[PDB]
């Protein structure tokens, strides 16, 4: 019975493809069982006769088993690198549950064999996992069955780098077991030369890095992006042992602590211009940052910070003097001591929102163009805003806080035009005659205990949106009639209202109105149902 | 709580895509449950903002439910013919068992 197989094989062994066709048809008629038909389909696939595979799949309708074995026709097709036969067989697999197990098995087989095209088609077209194990039944998930490891250990560097560029990751075993080719790939295929290189080792899940990998080129730059991985520690050279770095991305990792310094003498990276250490597990920043006078951006948000810096209230700090951006939001800071904060001179953007802050930091003469401190427990704001930021601050977000009254200073500002002052307990404003926010475009004064609200007449040409929903409003303040230029208004969530003023019709620019759960006595039900227009 | 949705929708209703981004990030921080995140992903997909769908799938890592419902972000993406958004969402589906049921729907 098995002879039929050999006979067909004989026809292919001598190159007699037509005789192989005849013997194959005879066996298919005599091969009723699924295993025998699968073997018949394996014969030409192993040989490489794509045409006869097509005939068997199309006319004989031969089933393609999903067993991840070397007897499988697709496995042998991948074994010999016959990409056309592999795709032809894989197309015949029925049902939605694509048999990934077979795909990983043949993927690792191709990686071991060196058939790059088969690996490419499997991973890119059929979605075979480049980071799972090609493990069969009664087999263990050993790294030898992992396709990147099998590719690089086999000497198939091209397949390994292709896998890395198309979803594979490095791990401790790769670096420890094959450090030479691993460092070769790290030192070649992630380098953007510019000397002052730009090396992107991020998104590689590297559990550790070594000076041995690139410190030889620390003359100007070794690397810049080490984010998006599982790093838990660093050499101190990575912070400050490199000469002409300009940007470092040390974010999105397990770096709960960064190496520190004893003085500025230990810092060689005096040229750093931005640093990204967010999305880490930091409780405080190292004081070495307080020696980088040239650093222009620091972003240490998405951390567990309790303080910006340790209480070094004696040292002549010069660093961060020219810092423009400090983003330390999404942290657990209750106090922002005036020491380090007043050491700044060039800050313009301060993002300290989403913290446990209760007192806004004691202000100082520094040109803040924008400040976000919402999602805090802030009780009040300083009165020196108009002293320092009268001509600088444009965006303010002190909303969602425990604040009860905004002093006149915020509204005495001139450059201020973007106000988010909701989510507070404020119930009364400073008199409108004291307001100098001529450039005001958006005023979000919702979600508070405000009732009368007054506006400068100048805002007749300035405001584009005004939010006053969800307040203690029983009657619309008549001052709204001033705001001809207003385009969007909220008045909903005010159950005490019954009259909609006629003067709102004078506000020509209106296109939308929050009429949510507002019953208007002086408007018929039909007009209310039709909408704001 | 539902207001967040409408607020983001408002930003897209007037064409304010950056304001929609800000409101979307705020809601994502305040939307922990899978259904709320799926709704947040449905908003731009129904609108057609492929960029914000990409940001949600890549950065926020928003889960894509396999329920064959008109609330599904991919279903609404197919509803308005936004082919790019449909492929972007369908690429995010994990695992080997490709949810054919959603695909037929």
Numbering used by the authors:
A (entry chain A): 51 to 244, 254 to 510, 539 to 620
B (entry chain B): 51 to 155
Can you quote the paper on this entry?
Leucine Rich Repeat Kinase 1 and 2 (LRRK1 and LRRK2) are homologs in the ROCO family of proteins in humans. LRRK1 and LRRK2 have a similar domain organization: an N-terminal half containing Ankyrin (ANK) and Leucine Rich Repeats (LRR), and a catalytic C-terminal half containing the ROC–COR ROCO signature, followed by the kinase and a WD40 domain. Despite their shared domain architecture and involvement in intracellular trafficking, their disease associations are strikingly different: LRRK2 is involved in familial Parkinson’s disease while LRRK1 is linked to bone diseases. LRRK1 and LRRK2 use different mechanisms of autoinhibition, with LRRK1 having a second level of autoinhibition absent in LRRK2.
We imaged full-length LRRK1 in the presence of guanosine diphosphate (GDP). Surprisingly, this construct yielded almost exclusively dimers, of which we obtained a 4.6-Å structure. Each molecule in the dimer has the same conformation we observed in the monomer; however, the ANK domain is fully resolved in the dimer structure. Surprisingly, despite the similarities in their domain organization and the structures of the monomers, the LRRK1 dimer bears no resemblance to that of LRRK2. While LRRK2 forms a parallel dimer mediated by a single homotypic interaction involving its COR-B domain, LRRK1 forms an antiparallel dimer mediated by several homo- and heterotypic interactions. The ANK–LRR domains of each LRRK1 wrap around those of the other, making symmetrical contacts between the ANK:ANK and LRR:ANK domains. A major interaction interface is formed by the kinase C-lobe and LRR domains of one monomer and the opposite molecule’s ANK domain. In contrast to LRRK2, whose dimer is mediated entirely by the COR-B domain in its RCKW moiety, the LRRK1 dimer shows minimal direct interactions between RCKWs; the only contact seen in our structure is a homotypic interaction involving residues 1,263–1,265 in the kinase N-lobe. The main contact between the two LRRK1 monomers, and the most striking feature of the dimer, involves the ANK domains; each ANK domain contacts the opposite molecule’s kinase on both its N- and C-lobes, effectively blocking access to the kinase. Our structure suggests that the LRRK1 dimer uses the ANK domain to accomplish, in trans, the steric autoinhibition achieved by the LRR domain in the LRRK2 monomer.
